């Protein structure tokens, strides 16, 4: 729907930034996870601290109220939080609160009905323990993937808002591990490399090749309401293509895609992990005040004493012959002003 195009919009801006940082490196993150956690945080924000996040997320307040937006998130978590037979989807939200603190009811309830958040009283006093506790909830929810989410813990940390997402799915037309073999993978215009290339032959898959952008779009579906769209820009087109990553250029890919028999398809078999500290990225996206001493998070307790310290994000992605596993977590470090 409309507010789904916001989420897409927020994904591409976040990507555009993460690349400005280290273009040369691979990328991997879940946009949905990030958007849910800052929408969750937003549940506790007020005034400008609120406008900002709700605008850093790419929402059009001119046409949407804060209740409609929060609702969007509940319906969505409701709809997708369900593992089919051949496709596992899991989404979780929890709030780790230090024992001393009593949080407003409106907040604890809204957390429950709206985002399905689980509470946990914590002793952020003894960092060592509080830490492990959060890490278990994440690794537990990600079936052993995100294992080092929180690595350090401020003894001043009054609260932490977490979100995890897990995806396990199979290919509709899986590769033959017997046919998997080494091949050249071009890092650059001349610097090649040997890599395990997974190959398939004579498949009829949703393809598309648009020249106005100089790239090729192929679609491989998973046995489930989920599919992977691989975009292959030509040599020296990557920049141009990332320039055009817009909710609309995506809308196009998915329309123009027409089934076709492909003689040969080659896809590397990869496994990648990435840690992220999102403070600077958020700042660039305009989510500023929440990080400042002018933090207005009164929605949580009932006074302007809380502020955000850090928003980190870990993701892992394995792409093998039989299918795909993917997973990520977002945690918001909330410190007392």
């Amino acid at each position: 729907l409309g507010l789904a195009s916001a989420n897409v919009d927020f994904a591409f801006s976040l990507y555009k930034q993460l690349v400005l940082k280290a273009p040369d490196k691979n990328v991997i993150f879940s946009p949905l996870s990030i958007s849910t956690a800052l929408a969750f945080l937003s549940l506790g924000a007020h005034n400008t601290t609120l406008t900002e996040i709700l605008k850093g997320l790419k929402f059009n307040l001119t046409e949407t109220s804060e209740a409609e937006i929060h609702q969007s998130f509940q319906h969505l978590l409701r709809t997708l939080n369900q593992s089919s037979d051949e496709l596992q989807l899991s989404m979780g939200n929890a709030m780790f609160v230090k024992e001393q603190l009593s949080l407003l009811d409106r907040f604890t309830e809204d957390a429950k009905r709206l985002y399905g958040s689980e509470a946990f009283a914590t002793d952020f006093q003894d960092s060592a323990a509080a830490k492990k506790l959060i890490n278990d909830y994440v690794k537990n929810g990600t079936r052993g993937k995100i294992t080092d989410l929180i690595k350090d813990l401020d003894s001043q940390t009054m609260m932490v808002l977490v979100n995890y997402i897990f995806f396990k799915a199979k290919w509709e037309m899986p590769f033959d591990p017997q046919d998997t073999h080494q091949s050249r993978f071009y890092l650059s215009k001349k610097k090649w490399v040997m890599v395990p290339m997974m190959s398939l032959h004579h498949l009829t898959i949703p393809y598309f090749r648009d020249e106005e952008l100089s790239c090729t779009v192929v679609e491989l579906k998973y046995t489930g309401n989920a599919s992977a769209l691989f975009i292959l820009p030509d040599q020296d087109k990557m920049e141009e293509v990332e320039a055009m990553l817009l909710p609309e250029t995506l809308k196009r890919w998915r329309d123009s895609l027409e089934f076709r028999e492909i003689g040969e398809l080659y896809l590397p078999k990869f496994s990648i992990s990435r840690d992220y500290n999102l403070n600077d990225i958020l700042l660039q996206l305009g989510i500023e005040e929440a990080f400042t001493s002018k933090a207005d998070l009164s929605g949580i307790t009932g006074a302007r004493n809380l502020a955000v310290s850090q928003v980190v994000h870990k993701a892992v992605l394995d792409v093998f012959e039989e299918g795909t596993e993917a997973s990520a977590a977002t945690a918001v470090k909330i410190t007392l002003l």
Partner: protein, 35 residues
């Protein structure tokens, strides 16, 4: 010539749901042999 798709260079990958346009995951593989 046969329509041959060979991903032997930095590609983009966007895992999205059927039931809506929303991006679950998104990666840019610049080099597979990271791990």
């Amino acid at each position: 010539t046969r329509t041959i798709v060979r991903f032997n260079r930095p590609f983009l990958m966007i895992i999205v749901p059927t039931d809506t346009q929303n991006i679950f995951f998104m990666s840019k593989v610049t080099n597979p042999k990271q791990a």
